[PDB]
Structure 1
Amino acid sequence: SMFLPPPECPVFEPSWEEFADPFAFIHKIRPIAEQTGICKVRPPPDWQPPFACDVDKLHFTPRIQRLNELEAQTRVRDYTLRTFGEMADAFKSDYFNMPVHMVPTELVEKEFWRLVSTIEEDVTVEYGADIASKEFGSGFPVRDIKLSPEEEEYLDSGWNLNNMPVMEQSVLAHITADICGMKLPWLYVGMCFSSFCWHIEDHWSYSINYLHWGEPKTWYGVPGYAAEQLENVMKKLAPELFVSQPDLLHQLVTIMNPNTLMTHEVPVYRTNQCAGEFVITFPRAYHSGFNQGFNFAEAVNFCTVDWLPLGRQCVEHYRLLHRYCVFSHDEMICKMASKADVLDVVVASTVQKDMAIMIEDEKALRETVRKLGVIDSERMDFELLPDDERQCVKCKTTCFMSAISCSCKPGLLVCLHHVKELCSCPPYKYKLRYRYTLDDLYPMMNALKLRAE
């Protein structure tokens, strides 16, 4: 009894009516799926986008992966798709001395958790993980090169993961301070035992993952509500993963047995995602897994109106951890407000709610730094500053509403939580740099209120 598989995560089979709008559907399943963190979505049976690729003209460089539980790996030779598949299939086939398509999923799972926990075995595999480029395009059809009408039906589908980010019910859309990390689909070419470590998404966003083809992808997921609980457990067993590092290029992640989590009463769910199925991860929902064999997946992050409050909670949490932000949440809120006329009216209503909190928090923060003896002030267009030039020098948060500077430490900023941390000149030498006066802010919100009624 080495491995006791976690209970199955929820599986949805939307009707074509239900399926019509992804954000509508995702909102409907949310009460269920956020209780399990991950869920699986089976498109209607005839929904099948064409995958078409030259297996010989796609090259990529693969990440080498040693399979050791609790060992630190960082988030992020040449193969064609075909050479990789030849390698992948030969590996699984030899590992089990079985026909590569005949190994039971149960067994691959059990064997995965055995080999990551045994120190004698030093199994190393290779993964491909990379964004859509001209050198490595989407597995979905994109508008250009000429498409068949089969491909054009799927060109504008909500579930084409290229359109998913930029749709109307979506929030990361009209961000202009762009991410690419979170706007653009990622492609994963898997092989047997290649894995992805426990993580949650940047800014606690949703993600959606489509397995285009090949053998299944096994997932473990934890509901967002048990996030910290999982983190406590992981802290206890692998504390060097929690040594805060100088960038998001350094955040440490690990493979860890879901049985270990279950023993400590952290709820874990599993699923085998098969070709043509979607997995959706909910905000702050931890997840990990491994591939059963040669396969091809595409994934993208996204943010709904449901998420906006969590997005603010996350940036707050990021500041306590002194973790770097991918983008400014406030800055996004204000870009939206400044486009209140062309916003979906449910979106505008939700932004207004978040903006009202932002403004009230900002009011109190400014009152506080005033009582500290910071008197001087000057407007500053923070969004013009490269991110490295507007991070709080203590908590590393990306400044947008306001910051404090000082002639004594030129170029340096702190957010208004860390006024004491800028330098040691007296606070009459400090300057409050701010994007907006409170008087600017209230009209922006009223624009949102007018749009929503």
Structure 2
Amino acid sequence: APSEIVGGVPVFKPTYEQFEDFYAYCKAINKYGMKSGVVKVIPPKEWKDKLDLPYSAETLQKIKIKSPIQQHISGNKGLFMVQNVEKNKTYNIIQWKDLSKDYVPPEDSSFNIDDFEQFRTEYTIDLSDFQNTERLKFLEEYYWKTLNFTTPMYGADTPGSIFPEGLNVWNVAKLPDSYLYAGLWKASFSWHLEDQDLYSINYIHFGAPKQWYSIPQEDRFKFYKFMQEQFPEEAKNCPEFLRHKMFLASPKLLQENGIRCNEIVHHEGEFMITYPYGYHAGFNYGYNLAESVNFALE
């Protein structure tokens, strides 16, 4: 299968025909993901129809944000290290959509089954805003300019899924183990490579887009050494600290260090596939709900 476009990152727009086989499709297009850190995969229209929108009141009620994480980040510029916090409290989707009213981007009680049935018209957020490229460029630049001035809060992994139960095609929840992230403006995921160095699919069910950065496998050693440069203290008692501590590094910085860095914007209804030995990191542009699993092809 051919790559449709490129934002430094391969973009695939498969037809339901080939899209049908997830394993055969992934195995027929792995040579691209092993070059660039990640690959985007837009599902076909006849697939998006298989979805049930809006989600039923129960589907929404099932959503439970277990142990939210706040991030305390510190660092001059380009380099930052994040100190994820604890959130003993727990939220439901309605509470999270409301919580996103505190973590708003710049410009320029007990609950009943009825509450969710009502919320079936408010679970989304206006996306026409993020349709502008220069708009996204702005947010990203503001994000790097002001990372240590805020304590972002993520909806750290929580088992579950919102994909149609009767859905077997591309069922990220059940493939022939799924988790939900709760996005919030400026919430960031540092540099890392999936455990056991496996693959993973990340799907944004709804909400603001995600920003993605990936290091081409070829540069995973330049990148590694450069990270041993800064933070030399860890270069001692650590064989693997990129998977021990949380570190953020801007592309603009890496670029000007002989380390290529891919960048792409992950939108609602799209799939991202992280490949083995493909370092990746990024942040959220605001309120969203994402689902992801880790798999293997061999």
Offset from partner CA, 1:285-315 (integer Å, 9 cap, x none)? 000010011011111111111xxxxxxxxxx
Deviations 1:162-192 (A, max 9, x none): 223xx2xxxxxxxxxxxxxxxx222101011
| 2:82 is the counterpart of 1:65 | no
Unaligned ranges ≥5, structure 1: 1-5, 143-151, 168-183, 306-453
1:206-221 equivalence runs, <5 A: 206-221=199-214
Give yes or no for contact 2:70–2:85 (8 Å, CA) kept in 1: no
- 1:111 maps to 142
Percent identity of equivalent pairs:
30
Q: Deviations over 1:3-36 (max 9, x none)?
A: xxx9531110001111011121112222223211
TM-score (norm 2): 0.78
Residues 67 and 115, structure 1, Cα contact 8 Å, conserved in 2: no
**Counterpart residue number, 2:96:** 84
SS at match of 2:152: strand
Correspondence 1:139 to 2:162: yes
In structure 2, how many angstroms separate the alpha carbons of the residues matched to 1:225 and 1:8?
A: 14
Alignment of 1:4-403 (within 5 A): 7-48=7-48, 49-50=51-52, 52=55, 53-54=59-60, 58-68=64-74, 69-73=79-83, 77-92=89-104, 95-97=105-107, 101=127, 102=129, 104-116=135-147, 121-132=148-159, 137-142=160-165, 152=166, 154=167, 156-157=168-169, 159-164=170-175, 167=176, 184-242=177-235, 244=237, 251-305=244-298
Report 1 or 2 for greater relative contact order, CA contacts < 8 Å, sequence distance ≥ 6: 2
Q: Distance in 2 between matches of 1:161 and 1:227?
A: 28
Task: Judge conservation of contact 1:224–1:282 (CA < 8 Å) in 2.
Answer: no
Q: Could you say if the C-alpha distance between residues 193 and 74 of structure 1 is closer, same or farther in structure 2, counting changes exceeding 3 Å?
A: closer
> Letter of the aligned partner of 1:138 in structure 2?
S
Task: Tell me the secondary structure at the aligned position of residue 249 of structure 2.
Answer: coil
Instruction: Note if contact 2:255-2:261 (Cα within 8 Å) is conserved in structure 1.
Output: yes
Q: Which has the higher strand share?
A: 2
In the TM superposition, residue 57 of structure 1 has moved relative to its aligned partner by 6.2
* Corresponding residue for residue 428 of structure 1: none
Distance 1:253 1:244, change over 3 A: farther
Aligned-residue offset at 1:79: 2.1
Pair 1:70–1:19, CA change in 2 (3 A): same
1:210 to partner: Cα distance? 0.8
* Aligned partners of 1:70 and 1:237 also within 8 Å: no
| Residue 119 of structure 2: aligned partner | none
> CA 1:31/1:247 → structure 2, altered by over 3 Å: closer, same or farther?
closer
- Contact kept in structure 2, 1:187 and 1:296, CA below 8 Å: yes
AA in 1 matched with 2:157: D
**One-letter code of the match for 1:130?**
D
Residues 113-155 of structure 1 show CA distances to partners (whole Å, capped at 9, x for unaligned) of 1113xxxx521111011231xxxx212233xxxxxxxxx2x2x
Supply the distance in 1 between the matched residues of 2:251 and 2:144 (Cα, whole angstroms). Answer: 9
> TM-score normalized by structure 1?
0.53
Tell me the matched-pair count: 259
**Inter-CA distance 63–242: structure 2 relative to 1 (3 Å threshold):** farther
Q: Match of 1:275, SS? A: coil
Q: Name which one, 1 or 2, has greater alpha-carbon Rg.
A: 1
Contact kept in structure 2, 1:196 and 1:288, CA below 8 Å: yes
Q: Is the partner of 1:83 in helix, strand or coil?
A: helix
Gaps of 5+ in 2: 1-5, 109-124
Aligned to 1:333: none
3-state SS, counterpart of residue 106 of structure 1: helix
Provide the C-alpha distance between the structure 2 equivalents of 1:15 and 1:122, rounded to a whole number of angstroms: 44
Query: How far did residue 270 of structure 1 move?
Result: 1.1
Aligned-partner residue type, residue 86 of structure 1 = D
Distance in 1 separating the partners of 2:290 and 2:30: 23
Residue by residue over 1:29-77, the C-alpha shift from the partner in whole angstroms, topping out at 9 and shown as x without a partner, is 2222321111100000131233623258634331011233422546993
In 1, Cα distance between equivalents of 2:217 and 2:236:
22
| Aligned residue identity for 2:152 | V
> Distance in 1 between the 2:297 and 2:266 partners?
23
Once residues 236 and 293 of structure 1 are traced to their aligned partners in structure 2, the CA distance between those partners, rounded to angstroms, is: 32
Q: Residue 73 of structure 2 contacts residue 82 of structure 2 at CA under 8 Å; is this kept in 1?
A: no
Moved more, 100-109 or 49-58: 49-58
Q: CA deviation at 1:223?
A: 2.2
Secondary structure of the residue that 2:265 maps to in structure 1? strand
Alpha-carbon distance between aligned partners in 2 of 1:23 and 1:7, rounded to the nearest angstrom: 24
